[PDB]
Amino acid sequence: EPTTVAFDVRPGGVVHSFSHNVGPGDKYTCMFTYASQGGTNEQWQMSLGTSEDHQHFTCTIWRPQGKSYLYFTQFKAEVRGAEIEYAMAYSKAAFERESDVPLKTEEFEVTKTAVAHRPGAFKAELSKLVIVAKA
């Protein structure tokens, strides 16, 4: 029943996935799959929001305070069975004196169901993903 859940983003280079679902029959699903290098785990948050029209929903994945130290070698946020209407990925998110810093055009790709890194162009820094979708 919580709409927001905490999860650990783990270094070590092995691929991990974390997912959360809300709504009748887990209608609204969001999954974050990644692999990273680093010294410590990072507790991130995944929030799923639902709108009045029973169709639109949002998935927001982020690291509190907007800075991540992990070297991501891959990432993919997926909303299976849904259609993305808006999405943005950030290397750094706004906090105190820092501004949001969107990933550069070449770093990622937005398909109907996913926001994913672009192999060979992604710069490895990520701290926030925002997805607005229609179930």
Numbering used by the authors: 3 to 137
Show passages lifted from the paper.
Recombinant full-length MYDGF, lacking the N-terminal signal peptide, was crystallized using sitting-drop vapor diffusion methods. MYDGF crystals diffracted to 1.6 Å. Due to the lack of initial start models, the structure of MYDGF was determined by Hg-SAD phasing by derivatization of a trigonal crystal form using Hg(II)I2. The MYDGF structure consists of 10 antiparallel β-strands forming two β-sheets, which are packed face to face to each other, forming a β-sandwich. The β-strands are connected by loops of 3–18 amino acid lengths and enclose a hydrophobic interior. A single disulfide bond between cysteine residues 32 and 61 of β-strands 3 and 5, respectively, bridges the opposing β-sheets. The asymmetric unit (ASU) contains two molecules of MYDGF forming a close contact. Analysis using PISA suggests that this dimer with a buried surface area of 1726 Å2 may be a physiologically relevant form. However, analysis of MYDGF by analytical size-exclusion chromatography clearly indicates that MYDGF is monomeric in solution. We conclude that MYDGF adopts a previously unknown β-sandwich topology.
MYDGF, previously named c19orf10 (chromosome 19 open reading frame 10), is a poorly characterized protein, which was identified as a paracrine-acting protein that is secreted by monocytes and macrophages. Human MYDGF has 142 amino acids and consists of an N-terminal 31-residue-long signal peptide and the MYDGF protein sequence containing a C-terminal KDEL-like ER retention sequence. According to its primary amino acid sequence, MYDGF does not belong to any known cytokine or growth factor family. Treatment with recombinant MYDGF helps to protect and repair the heart after acute MI.
